[PDB]
Design a protein around this ligand. Sequence first.
Ligand SMILES: *C/C=C/c1cc2ccc(N(CC)CC)cc2oc1=O
Length: 133
Amino acid sequence: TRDFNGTWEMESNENFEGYMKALDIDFATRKIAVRLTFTLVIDQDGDNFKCKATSTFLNYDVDFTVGVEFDEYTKSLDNRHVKALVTWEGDVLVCVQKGEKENRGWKKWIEGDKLYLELTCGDQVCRQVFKKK
Ligand SMILES: *C/C=C/c1cc2ccc(N(CC)CC)cc2oc1=O
């Protein structure tokens, strides 16, 4: 299924610390943020996505259309400009964020009935798993 709609509650978070370090997030924001549990609210209609990730300290909002390149200013994270593009590889949603970081982006898929989110920057990979509320 290609249908990521819903409210998704974190059940596991692996190596968020390495992902944020590869982004050069400052120590005190990082040290707080690696403790956090996240909730995802995804609204998906065809190509049109609206995503909202929330925690007690870090929030991240993105809206995009599959197949349409867009500019992203990662204000809530590392404060960089990237050229982002989200496309389908089979049933995996793939985002590439072109900028000064290599292999920066993410991949999302459903396995069974959970949502998997893989965050990449440089040589670091973070894996998060969510359950549909
Ligand atoms: C449905 C895909 C949108 C989406 C992708 C995300 C990428 C990165 C992040 N974080 C915080 C965990 C790092 C910047 C969150 C996120 O959530 C989403 O809903």
